[PDB]
Structures are given as C-alpha cells and as structure tokens.
Design an enzyme around this catalytic site. Structure first.
Site, mmCIF file in Angstrom:
data_model
loop_
_atom_site.group_PDB
_atom_site.id
_atom_site.type_symbol
_atom_site.label_atom_id
_atom_site.label_comp_id
_atom_site.label_asym_id
_atom_site.label_seq_id
_atom_site.Cartn_x
_atom_site.Cartn_y
_atom_site.Cartn_z
ATOM 1 N N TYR A 127 11.626 8.396 0.582
ATOM 2 C CA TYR A 127 11.691 7.414 -0.517
ATOM 3 C C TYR A 127 12.181 7.827 -1.820
ATOM 4 O O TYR A 127 12.100 6.906 -2.811
ATOM 5 C CB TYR A 127 10.072 6.784 -0.651
ATOM 6 C CG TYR A 127 9.422 6.315 0.777
ATOM 7 C CD1 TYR A 127 9.787 5.360 1.175
ATOM 8 C CD2 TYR A 127 8.351 7.307 1.327
ATOM 9 C CE1 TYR A 127 9.239 4.723 2.305
ATOM 10 C CE2 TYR A 127 8.106 6.795 2.455
ATOM 11 C CZ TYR A 127 8.246 5.712 2.944
ATOM 12 O OH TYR A 127 7.741 5.242 4.291
ATOM 13 N N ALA B 117 3.164 -0.420 5.025
ATOM 14 C CA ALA B 117 2.818 -0.338 6.238
ATOM 15 C C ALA B 117 2.196 -1.644 6.634
ATOM 16 O O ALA B 117 2.018 -1.623 7.807
ATOM 17 C CB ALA B 117 1.726 0.925 6.112
ATOM 18 N N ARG C 245 5.205 10.628 -2.590
ATOM 19 C CA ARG C 245 5.207 9.844 -1.398
ATOM 20 C C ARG C 245 6.171 10.483 -0.646
ATOM 21 O O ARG C 245 7.198 9.776 -0.931
ATOM 22 C CB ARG C 245 4.887 8.423 -1.272
ATOM 23 C CG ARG C 245 4.901 7.821 0.064
ATOM 24 C CD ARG C 245 5.345 6.390 0.108
ATOM 25 N NE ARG C 245 5.113 5.766 1.175
ATOM 26 C CZ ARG C 245 5.515 4.497 1.648
ATOM 27 N NH1 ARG C 245 6.551 3.996 0.739
ATOM 28 N NH2 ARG C 245 5.180 4.241 2.610
ATOM 29 N N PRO D 71 0.914 -1.313 -0.157
ATOM 30 C CA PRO D 71 0.093 0.035 0.085
ATOM 31 C C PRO D 71 1.034 1.235 0.018
ATOM 32 O O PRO D 71 1.872 1.265 0.634
ATOM 33 C CB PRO D 71 -0.638 -0.014 1.322
ATOM 34 C CG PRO D 71 0.145 -1.025 2.032
ATOM 35 C CD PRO D 71 0.529 -2.098 1.204
ATOM 36 N N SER E 66 13.191 2.512 3.195
ATOM 37 C CA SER E 66 13.667 3.230 4.405
ATOM 38 C C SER E 66 13.924 2.240 5.406
ATOM 39 O O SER E 66 13.858 0.917 5.403
ATOM 40 C CB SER E 66 12.521 4.117 4.784
ATOM 41 O OG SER E 66 11.642 3.412 5.554
ATOM 42 N N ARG F 83 6.962 1.485 13.638
ATOM 43 C CA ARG F 83 7.511 1.030 12.349
ATOM 44 C C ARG F 83 8.704 0.018 12.663
ATOM 45 O O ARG F 83 9.045 -0.567 11.736
ATOM 46 C CB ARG F 83 8.158 2.116 11.508
ATOM 47 C CG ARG F 83 7.154 3.083 11.050
ATOM 48 C CD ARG F 83 7.686 4.209 10.159
ATOM 49 N NE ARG F 83 6.915 5.325 10.015
ATOM 50 C CZ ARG F 83 5.808 5.300 9.212
ATOM 51 N NH1 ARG F 83 5.486 4.178 8.429
ATOM 52 N NH2 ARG F 83 4.872 6.136 9.009
ATOM 53 N N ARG G 259 13.321 4.716 12.323
ATOM 54 C CA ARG G 259 12.128 5.833 12.575
ATOM 55 C C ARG G 259 11.242 5.425 13.937
ATOM 56 O O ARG G 259 11.714 5.024 14.791
ATOM 57 C CB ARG G 259 11.175 5.266 11.048
ATOM 58 C CG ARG G 259 12.073 5.528 9.882
ATOM 59 C CD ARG G 259 11.239 5.499 8.363
ATOM 60 N NE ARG G 259 10.048 6.275 8.363
ATOM 61 C CZ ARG G 259 9.242 6.025 7.398
ATOM 62 N NH1 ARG G 259 9.680 5.013 6.459
ATOM 63 N NH2 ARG G 259 8.127 6.777 7.398
ATOM 64 N N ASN H 233 7.555 -5.749 -1.018
ATOM 65 C CA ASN H 233 7.680 -4.647 -0.165
ATOM 66 C C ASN H 233 6.081 -4.814 0.327
ATOM 67 O O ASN H 233 5.304 -3.857 -0.209
ATOM 68 C CB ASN H 233 8.327 -3.262 -0.728
ATOM 69 C CG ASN H 233 8.251 -2.254 0.098
ATOM 70 O OD1 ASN H 233 7.553 -2.419 1.242
ATOM 71 N ND2 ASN H 233 9.018 -1.198 -0.189
ATOM 72 N N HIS I 270 12.388 -3.132 2.431
ATOM 73 C CA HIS I 270 11.929 -2.002 2.974
ATOM 74 C C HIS I 270 12.849 -0.851 2.438
ATOM 75 O O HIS I 270 14.020 -1.093 2.561
ATOM 76 C CB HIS I 270 11.884 -1.866 4.436
ATOM 77 C CG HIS I 270 10.745 -2.748 4.803
ATOM 78 N ND1 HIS I 270 9.456 -2.293 4.927
ATOM 79 C CD2 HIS I 270 10.748 -3.883 5.377
ATOM 80 C CE1 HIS I 270 8.908 -3.510 5.305
ATOM 81 N NE2 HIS I 270 9.450 -4.249 5.692
ATOM 82 N N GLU J 189 11.808 -9.907 1.533
ATOM 83 C CA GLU J 189 11.232 -8.545 2.059
ATOM 84 C C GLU J 189 11.792 -7.525 1.810
ATOM 85 O O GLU J 189 13.221 -7.531 2.064
ATOM 86 C CB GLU J 189 10.722 -8.883 3.511
ATOM 87 C CG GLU J 189 9.983 -7.775 3.951
ATOM 88 C CD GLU J 189 9.828 -7.918 5.637
ATOM 89 O OE1 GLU J 189 10.355 -8.715 6.241
ATOM 90 O OE2 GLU J 189 8.890 -7.106 6.225
ATOM 91 N N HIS K 92 3.658 -3.761 9.765
ATOM 92 C CA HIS K 92 3.751 -3.515 11.085
ATOM 93 C C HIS K 92 2.452 -4.447 11.520
ATOM 94 O O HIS K 92 2.474 -4.674 12.943
ATOM 95 C CB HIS K 92 3.748 -2.112 11.260
ATOM 96 C CG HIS K 92 4.782 -1.482 10.534
ATOM 97 N ND1 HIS K 92 6.063 -2.155 10.808
ATOM 98 C CD2 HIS K 92 4.752 -0.590 9.738
ATOM 99 C CE1 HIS K 92 6.736 -1.205 9.774
ATOM 100 N NE2 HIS K 92 6.160 -0.350 9.268
#
Lengths: 144, 145, 143, 143, 145, 144, 136, 136, 144, 145, 136, 143
Positions: free
Chosen positions: B26, B80, B21, B13, B105, B114, B110, B77, B103, B101, B83
C-alpha cells in the site's frame, strides 16, 4: 522528441465501436477514439499508437513487440478477457506497466463476464468508466 | 482551477493505518498525506474535495446516505468490506450521482478471497491496482463528467 | 525410407529463450527445431518442426497430418487450458499423437492444471523440459 | 519487566455463562478475565483482557497492538466465519497472534468450519474450552 | 421457387473437413456437397443462399459484422467455438435479423464439455442432433418468417 | 397494564425507508412504520417498541436484552441476513419466539439475496408481503 | 554408479492378469537401463508403509525415482508428502491415459510434487523416464 | 498413573530431514510430561494398521491421546473412525499452520471427531496438549 | 392410406397456449396448434396425432404405446424437461426417432431452465423457433 | 364480517394426512379441521374462502389455471413440490391476483434438500415456520389488499 | 464346493465395543452358509495390503466375495481397483444406512465396481448377500 | 396369521421384460408379482404387489401402509433421483421400509447415483436384479 511511446491495443469487436449499445459504449467510432487518445497523449507529452484487431495471432505479435521494446501497454482484451489464456500468457512477457481497460462495468453484466483471466497478470484494471477509462490509463502512464 | 463542484472521497476499514499497513503493498504515504494530496489535486481540477476515513460501517453508511441526499459524487475505497459487506453495497445503491470504487492493490493478483467485490456491480465503475494514483484518476473522471 | 514425424508448437513458443529460463531454457525455437531434427535423424526419423500463434494455421497443419497419417508431437501451450477447436482438430488424427508440456503444469496455478487436449491424444509428457519432445520422438521411433 | 500480552474477545463473548454451558462453561467474561490475568501473573506475563461486539473498537485494539508489538490472543467468535475487515487488521500485527475458539468449530454446522482468520495468524487452538486461552498464554510465556 | 431473400450460412472450425471428420458422427457428405445442397434447397424456397466456412475467428467475426450491417438472416454452426468463444458470441449480438444456431450432432448426448453453448442465449434459436438436415430446417424457418 | 411487550428491530439501511424503491418498499418512512406498528399492536393488546440501527454492536445489545427479558422479537436484519453470523449467533440466545421479516421478495431478487443465515435460528420467516409483513408477525405473537 | 529406482504401487503386482507380467516389465527395464549405462532396480508393493520407506531411503541416497503410484495417485497425500523429501529427480508414470478415463481418475495428487509425469504411453513410458534420466 | 499417549503418523519419523529429530521430540515430551506428573509415551508409524491398533488399545485403556495424523488428516476416514472409539480426550496437533498452506491441506477429516485441535504452534503444540491434559 | 403415423406430445401447462407470454408463445391456442400440425402433416403425407396432458402417468402411457407401435414422436416436455427423469426413462424405450421441441429459447431464460434431462435421450432438439419448431420436426420426419 | 371476496387455499402432496403426518413437526389438527378453521377465520374477515387439497399435480395445475382465469387470490402450500416441481411453478406464473406461499414448518431449520423453494421467486411472498397460523396470516394480508 | 469369502475392512475387528462381536458374526455366517449349502470363510483386517492380497486370490480362484469396506468405502481407490479384478460376483455390505449419516459417508467409491450393494439392514445384510449367492 | 407385506413398484416398471434384459431380465411385471407372492408364501408372508406410473396413486398406497403398519418394499425407479413428494410419503411409514433398485445405480450415469429416498427408509438393496426383492422379503420374514 524524448516523448514516451505508449501502445493502446483493442481486441475483438472493438472495430465496431459506435454501432453497438450506445448508452454503454457511446456513438464514438474506433477511428474517433484513436484520434482522441493520440491528441490527449500529445497534451501529456506521450507518443500514443492505437491498434485494434479481431486476430489473436496479430494481438500476440503486438504484445511480443511491446515486451521487446519495453513499451507501456493499455489493453482492452474485450471478450478474450473471459477465457483467452494465450493472450494472458503473452501479457506476462511485458516488462513495462500494462493497464487493462473495460468500457462497460463487467461486474454489473452477466456472470460469464465477471471474471477476467488478464487482471492477475497486469499492473491494474479500469472498468465501467467508458471511453474516458483509456484517458485515465494514459494519465497514470504520463507520471509513471 | 476554480474549486466549486463538491466530491466526497470515503475510505473504509484499516485505511486509517496507511503508511504502517503492509507498506510493500500500500506504500509509505499516511492517510493524512493522501487526504491533503487529493484536496490539492481536486483544487487544480476545480473540484471541492472532502476526504473521510472510518472503520465504522454505521458511520460509513451515514456518509453514503447524506451523499445520496446531496447528489454528491463519491469515490469509495471499501477495502476489506468489498469482499462481503452487503450492508455497504445496499447503501451505495441509494446514491444518484456517479460513484467510483478504488482499490489501491491489484485484488485480482492476490488471494482468491480478495478477487470478488460485492460493491462493483452497484457503482459506476472500478479502478484497481493503480496505487494511490487511482484516487486521482477517479477525480479526473469526475472533473469532466 | 525414413518415417515422417510432425512437431507442432502453439502460442507464445516462438518466444522460447526470452523468459523463465529455469522452466523453458535459454534456447530459441530455431535452436529447438534444429535439435529435434538432428535427434530424429539419429533415430531414423524425418522430423519437421513448426510453430504458430494462429489457431487457423495450427488446425490446417493438424488436418494435413490427419490426411497424411503423420504422427504428431504437439505442445498446445496455453490452448491446452480452453481451446476446444484445437482438441476437435486433434480427434481427427489417425496416427498416434503425443501432447508435450515443457513445464510441470500440475505444479502451477489451478487454471493451468486441466488440459482439454489430454483425453483426445495417445498420451502426455509434462514437466520434463525440452527433453520431453525427445522422449516423444523416442516413443514414435519404435512404434 | 513483565511481558505485556493482549487477550481480545469478539462478539457475543460478553454473554459467557448465559447459554450452552457444556461448551462455554458457567463462568462470566469478568471471571474469565480475572482467571487469565492471574494465570499470566504466575507465568511472569502482564495480561490485559478486553471484549467487544464492535468491529471498529476491535480493529482499534488490533492497530494499537500492531504499533506496540504486543502479542495477541484473539477469539474472533462469529467474525471468524466471514469478517475480512478483522482478518485485514490482524495481518498488520508484528508480534505473534494465536486464534482461540472455545468450541470445536469442526464438530459444528458446516458454516462454522472455515475461519477467515486462521491463515493470517501464527496458529490456532479450537475445542479445548476456556483452557485454550491458558495454552495460548503458556506458548507466549516461552516465546 | 423465386430466389431473392438473401440468407447467409456460416460454418466454423473443422467443418471444412466434413466427409473425413469423424464420419460415424457427422456423415460422409463433403463441405462442397453441403454448400451445393443448401443453395439448391434455398432456391426451391425462393431464398438466395450463400454458404461460407472458416477456421479463422477473425474472418468469421468479419462475416457476422457485415450480416449485421446488411440485415441478412444467418444460420451459424460455430462447431467447437460454441463451448467457449465469447468473442464469436459477442459478434452475434450485433445481428439484427434472425440467427439460428445449428449443431449436426446431438451435443447433449456427447461428453459433458460439449453440453453447454455460449452462443445459444444470443441467437433466435438452436437446432441440434438432426444432422445436415438441421441446416435445411433452419432455411425452412427463414423462408416463412 | 398486563399488555405483552414485543420488540421490533430493524437493521441496516431501514432508517432510509421512503427514499428507496417505492414499488417494493413503499413511500412510508421508518417513523411512519414505527407509529403504525405501535397503534396496530395496541389494538391487539400488545405493548410494541420499534428500534432501527445501522450498528451491529447496538443491534446485538438489543437482542441480548430481549434474551434476558424473554421479549418476543420481530427482526428485519436487511442486508445482514445474507452473511452476518454475529447477528445469527445473538438471535440463538433468544428464549421467546423470533420472526424474521423481509419487506421485499428476496427469492425473486439477485442470487446473493436468496439465502438468509438468520432463518434457521428463528421461529419463522415472512418475505415479500411488504410493510404488512410486520403486522402479520404481530398478529401471530398476539395469540401465542 | 548411475543408480535409478523404479517403484510400482498397488495392484501393479497383478500386471498381465489385471499380457506382460510385473516380472517381465522389471527384466525389460533392468536390461534397457544397462544399455543406457544405468543400474536399475524395480520394486513393487501394495503397502504404503513399505513404499514410504523406499522413498525415504531414495531421499537419503539422492537416487532418481520413477514411480507409478497407480490408484494412490488419486488421493494418497501420505505418498505425495514422502515424495516431497526426494532430492534427485522423480518422474511419475501412468501406463493408461488417465485423462481419457472416468473423472475420478483425472487428478493426480502426486503430479505437483515430482519433476514430471508421463501418461498413456503404455509400459514404454517407463523406458522414456529412464532415457530422460540417462542424460540428466 | 496419569498415562498419556502421543501418536505420530506418516513421514513424522523423518522430522529434522523433512532440525529437531523424532527421537529429540520424544525425549522432550517424556521429560516435559514428567515435570507435569504425566507418564508420557511417544510412538510413530507410517502404517495405518499399526496406528489403528494403538488407538483401539487407548480406547480400551481410557488413555488420553495426542495425535498428529500428518497427511492422513486430509483424507483418512479409517483413522477418523478409529478415533471415534476413544473414551478419554484426544487432541489433534499440526506442527505447521495448515490454514496458511495449499487449499488441499485446509480440511482435516479428524478435527470433528476429537476433543480439540492445535495448529501452527510448532513442536510446542505437543507441550500445550500435555499441559491441557495435566489439569483435565 | 400408406401415410406415416407421427405422434406430437405436449406436456404440462401447454393446454394454456394463447393465455401466456404472447411475444414468446403466440396467441395461438393448443386446439389451433393441433389443427395446424395435422394440416401441415397431411401436406407432407404424414398422419399426425396431437395430444396434451398435465399428467405424467398419461404422458408415460402415450410414450409406452409409441415404443410398442414404433411411432416417431415430437415431444415438448415443457417444465418436465428440467427435472423429470421418469419421462426421460420412458423416452429411452422409443425405437423410432424422437425430437424434443421447446417453443421458447430456454438458453436465454433463467439458469434453472438451461438444462434438459430429455435432450441426451432423443434424436435431437429444436429450441426458440416458436410454434414453427413443431413444423420443422415434422419436415425432418417426412424425409426420414 | 361480510363474506364476499373469494380466496382459494390450495394444499399439495401429503397434506391430506395432516394430524397423522409427523405430528411433532406439523401438529395434530386434521386437514378437515384446518379447512373448517380457515373458512371460519375468512368469514370473520369478510372473505369467502375455499380450501382444496390434492396429491395430483394435474389436479393442482387445473385449480391454478382456473384461479388465473377467475383472478382469484391464492394461498398455496406446495409442500414437497416446493423443492423441485417446475411444472407447479410454471402454473403459478399464470396467476394475475396475488399468491402467497405457506410452509407450516421452518424449512430453513430442516435438511439442506428442504431449504430451497422453486415456487418463492414466482409468487407475491412466502410465510414459513409459523405453523397452521401461517395460513391465517396469509388471509389477513389478502383481507386488506 | 460352493465357497464364499466374507471380507471385513477397517475397525470391524472392534464390532461390539465400537453388542455382537466380530467372532459372533463370523460364527453366525459360517453356520448360516452351511444351512444354505455354502462353505463360508470370514476374514477381517485393518491392512489394505492384506485385504488387496485376499481380493487378488479370490480373483484367481473365482470365489464370490461379500465385502464390507467400512471407512475405505468413502475414498480407497486402491481397494476399488483390486475389486475390479474379481471374476465371480461381489456384494458390498454396509451395516448402517450410510445415506442417513453425514454427507462424507454418502458416496462409496466401491459401489460402481461390484455386483450390488446392501446398506442399512444391519448384520442381517451379510445373510441376505449369502442367500443371493446360494441361488446364483 | 400370515404377516402382510406390500411391494410397491414405481414408474416404467410395468414395462419389465421390454428393454435392457441383461439388467432387468426378460420377465414381465405380472411374472415378477406371481414369483414374489409365491416366495412370500414359502416364508409365511402374505405379499401384495402393486405397480403405478402415478405419484398420486403411489402416495395413496404409502399412506395406507402407514395407517396399517404394513412393512413396504419399494422400487421408486426414476422417482429415486428427484421425487421429494414420494420421499415425504415414505417418512410417514411406521413399519420397516426397504428400497430396492434392480440395476446397480452406482455403475450408471452420475444423474442416477443419488437417491432422495435412501436417507428416509430402513435400508437399500441395489444391483442384485429381481432377486433383490426376494432378499427384502427374507429380511422382513425374520424381523
């Protein structure tokens, strides 16, 4: 020549690579891993040095020198990842990028292994991709 | 450079809005630009890469189920969803071929909400904080597996 | 007849002057040692200042201060957050021991708030910069 | 020249009027939409009101409000307690965003006390019933 | 009483100061006195006992690695390392022959920070609170294994 | 005829029944399970409908319709049980009884699976009794 | 003038019964301050309203503060939020080593919001705070 | 008369130094109230005793209350238990978005015991509370 | 004769020794264990009595009598170790030494088994050394 | 309807007072009435059902041990023991034949101290909140196993 | 004289509105005390400063104290640290059964620092505290 | 016509007089029973005092008090910290029930602070020694 110097630093128990849980860590020795990364680095135009220690003092000294030299670091802090704030505080002194590498998938292991005190303080982290994770870190640094 | 082993890259998402974004986090590359880049990088490694993005957990679960049946390696990826979304984690447990997987960032640097991924325990491994290049590292891993 | 005092600095403090000057100052560890020896002399103290990144070496210095009944001013730095081996050495000290943090550890990340050393020493000074060491020496001058 | 405002209602709010009238009122979602459009018009606002049980559809509406710089009044309903995907959409909004809860979530079960949305929006109104939406519009009328 | 099966007793940080170290808790015997006692007690059981002490985690890890390769049973008192030192726990996982953790003091009766050992899950078993005699119990166990 | 209507609702990943961990979930497909419950229901004088979705929107719509129709519900929220308050808040609108069913013994699995956010809001719960748990739920509703 | 304000919170009026009295401490710090070329005043209250007023005036005057919040340290966010308004330095003093006491005494809500903290060094802790401020 | 009481807790007397002053806020709300046909009074105190007395009298008078407990929100159960006595509505206002701040600021002990809460909408939050009470 | 009396007390489920997980607990029965400890004790000049109960009342009565008699106790509270404060409060009345014995390595098992409520209140604890742990406890008491 | 396969129903503490015990929660049927009902329902399924109730953990443990040796399927309502009694959980681990935990009330809908069962991880499965009919569901399950 | 001090904390001045009033309770305990040969005084305040002063004087006078800290029980370490100074016995009274209420009401910071606690026995709890002190 | 009251003492209280006299007194359980029966008689109560280490026996006594509507004064002793079976028996009582602890459980180790019984009874007396039982009887004399 003008070849970019990179430091790969391995922390405690990684001098025993090859003797441990082979389905996770491989049967490759630390000497075999060092030779592999130096050769892989050379193909990417990197000058790679690979060092391993069970001594937090010696590791901190290597990180301090990388800070002063602005040498990019690939670090596997091994069990120190779970608690060793002295090592995390040394890594904050680095100027050039730093990639944390875990051979095993620490998220799939015991709960005491899930959290790294290092991850917040480095560029990024690679976990669970075996010894090939070190090569991915070098590939990233080759185009940085 | 012979493009034959099929790989699926699945983006969850908010990743359709890459470029707009939070670009300070990013970057300024669009999702279309990223898809073209990974297909090209894959071709150089002799991989046949497909890149898909959805905000729909139903659609994502369907893509994962089909990759399970096709034995297609997946680079995901979950953004969100990482989490909290146990439905996505439970789909990924059905995969047979490796799953990485990614990510963009450094989630550990963070907010505390997260830091934990519900996906990480259920995949081969995880790359975090290495930007859009993390997807290329995942493909590099899959090229030699 | 000058009272001997030991100042012991733990990991990363050999790099004083390198980073975060607004917290740690622009002074080197050698400059800090010279300053505390001079400050001590003015108070009639015989001050020795030592720094190590080695917990073995630090434990040896604490053991010798226990045997000699030498008052200790210690900055355990990151060891404060976890190092029970250093805390178990410090419990063996007989003469007073003052823990010093240059930075205000309460104002930093939550992982820095708790010291495993503070329960085991006479008292603690935090956030008062390099001058915190001088306050510890001032306390020991009149003890 | 009327300022456009988007009111977005999340899951289960299409059933307004069905249960717990002492909290949610006896009004339907259609009745609430008509009321807020009329209230907005009186303030010189051009109000659109949308409701969905679909997080995909909601994320699309938030993305369009980010692109259009349209101020948003959002009631994420149960998504407030867990839905980080909705929180990550809302962080992309450029114009102000006000979170509204009809019920007093602090007065309910402990699982309802924490909102994952509140840190990411301009501000929050809770427990002031359907009138909470009108307060959000009043704030946006003078911003 | 025929001294042949080799056993390694390994003492961690602060145990070199036995006799001066909080004697109301740990007693008045020195580390040298303890080593002589365990070697003598071992000889009576037909064990060849070596006793080593270090404040250096590097040196301790090296001793554990060699005991793994030698298949030598280990009696370890990790002292304060027990509460946090995962590097020492991860060395002990390499041992093949049995390993017994010994604490001189009853750690459960002390401050809460001393209650948990990170070592206990990774060894054969643990003896706590039985004083210096706990080392002799560990040797007695190993004599008949 | 005057046969009592019952709705069986299956949430995410349950469309894959038969492909997963067979010692726990069986080799029975979702189509096989639906046919079995409809037949079992008919023997008890129940008119059973069985629906499965990976879509929380679609599931919420089915629960809202059961609320309006006063249709008793047997629900397996699957992974949504651990976190999905939107689904729990839809179930609170039901008037007729609602039984939560878990095929696996969630108490015997990872700690993240132990807690259901649904259980407080339904009549009761059946866990670890396999696909037969659905038949037990229908048996209960037959004499209600 | 190098003015310093020493502020003592609840129950500290009972020093010596709770053997040096609060009056004895105040006289000692005024004298010690004078020796360092500081103009020291010492105030004590059990009233959070009175303490907040003293802190507000120190903020406006840019007067360095040495504060012993005593039991307010463990919970009183009103006092912590007053201290955030200070412009000049502020040193928190605890007479006892709060880290060595019950767990409910370990955390101070004040420590994050001040310059620094001195704990466990007895009434001499106040004199160290003054010594710090003499050279600042 | 449609009387409303606005009660401000600790440190809010320092608004503008802590650029609108407490006096400027009070004048604004009295004027805004008059425009809505409300008779508004605004009171501020750092004294929990004085605040409790104001709340007790509002309970007896059935006067709607708009309260900003400021730091008392995070811990002061005495103030929360006074507010439980109110008969008419009570709206809690936070100027800042407390959810976006440090974790120690996230929880209010007041929120469960009042009608509703407005947070993060600045001084305009007070005007929204008055607008709500104008039509109640 | 002048032989030192020792009481070995075994709590719940230990009457089933031999039937359970043999790689951990052995195939030795409780009767076999009692005979072994009595014989081992005799060789050390101890007069050992071995008792087992599933009854907390009966166990508390045996501990109260050991308190009054000043008899050293070796206790395996078994599952009561994790929660039973009534048993812990009885043990605080003992005057002579008390050694807690766990056959299994409780630290290596589920998290609910890690904590003993008894350990703080006794002389010391032996865990994970199997049935031989009882013999170690007797060896300690022989020279006390 | 041929009563031959033996099943044991075991009820723990306070269940002897069914009918008087908080009837708004547990109903007005006595324990004697429940036992007669389950024996009759069992007979209809061709099960030979025995129903036993005790407030004594010693007596309950003895019944569980004998069911382990007899390979008798067990339906157990541990009542308040569910929240804490590891001795009862450790007895149930000895069972070989299936074991179903039953709670008359919906424990998830009550106080937080009632939400967790220490028994649930160690049995086949659990039925909660379906009243006295939950016992009949457990027997129905065992009739076809 | 067998003097006893009964001290009531915040919001207890509102007993009967919050049907026995604080005045009715005070009259009852003075009368009940006299029947037991005790000289009882009853005081109530919403001011922690005033309460601390009353406790300090009871410490100096060695007067037994019956205290109902009301909401201060859950957090007020300043009041707990005043009570530590008492020499004669101190009994904490809660009118309601705080264990049966919300979780935030279960813990008292006072209970560890006093002789004993009586909870849930209504206003008769005060009379039990007096009965205990009559024979001590 | 004397009102019947049941005093029930749980585990380890049969050993009153053996240990920690400064908390529990030097009196035996038999001496305490005689004292409470006499104190009860003075108040016009018919008091019975029973002690057991058996939770089965205690549950039976609570069940009979529920059936008889006999007010109960209970000291569950260590069962207070964990024994939900005893708490589930006490919830069935109809007449009042007062929990008594001889010691100040708030002043002891953290594992002793929480009682699982207190939420389920009328009220609780802790830390007032053997006299706590007499206070419970005084309360029941005027109820």
């Amino acid at each position: 020549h003008m070849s970019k110097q990179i430091l790969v630093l391995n922390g405690p128990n990684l001098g025993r690579l090859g003797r441990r849980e082979p389905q996770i860590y491989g049967t490759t020795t630390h000497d075999d891993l060092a030779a592999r990364l130096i050769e892989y680095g050379r193909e990417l135009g990197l000058d790679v040095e690979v060092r391993q220690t069970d001594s937090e003092e010696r590791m901190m000294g290597w990180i301090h020198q990388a800070a002063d030299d602005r040498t990019p670091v690939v670090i596997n802090p091994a069990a120190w990842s779970h608690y060793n704030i002295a090592i995390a505080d040394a890594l904050v002194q680095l100027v050039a990028p730093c990639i944390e590498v875990h051979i095993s998938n620490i998220a799939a292991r015991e709960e005491f292994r899930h959290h790294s005190v290092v991850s917040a303080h480095v560029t990024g982290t690679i976990a669970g991709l075996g010894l090939k994770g070190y090569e991915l870190a070098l590939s990233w640094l080759a185009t940085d």
